Amino acid sequence: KKKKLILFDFDSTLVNNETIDEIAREAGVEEEVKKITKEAMEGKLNFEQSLRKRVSLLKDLPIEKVEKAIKRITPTEGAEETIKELKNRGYVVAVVSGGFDIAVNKIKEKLGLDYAFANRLIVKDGKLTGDVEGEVLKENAKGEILEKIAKIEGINLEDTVAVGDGANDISMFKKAGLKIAFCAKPILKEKADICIEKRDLREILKYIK
């Protein structure tokens, strides 16, 4: 029983939604933020700068509204069944995201994931301050996290799998044993071993040892 590890990106992969675009709707800036999110996922913008820019537009948004947005996030088709089978096949399952703990940790709890890494929205007096902080901002951040988790678990990098859809998943792919682009952007598909174009996470299972 050689241990294995699979890491999932969150927005548009493990869940249907883009967390930040949902929150942007509550702040009345959905269109503006969605445009930046798309450019960042296409690899046209630096991730950290793009995230800080989007989060500044959310300044003063009440936490009550952030929560309403988060309540709308739903797991991607086949997420539960895929996670179950992955655990049956002996995998440690993790979610690594450039999104936010308040949304990611809910799903980590709901789906029973082993690890969850995300950034943090800063709040004061019940409202967003417009700032974000975290360790999933730099270009190489996700790759470093994959290595960190694998090291803790004593899992060889060759026995790791990464599933993602955007440009900030590139460093995660770089360190992964098997790279799966799930209904992904061109910049990521070019770096993938396997490209899945049907939106059902169960489609990755046929490729998993």
Ligand code: ALF
């Ligand atoms: F959850 Al992501 F880029 F979609 F970190």
Ligand SMILES: [Mg+2]
């Ligand atoms: Mg994504």
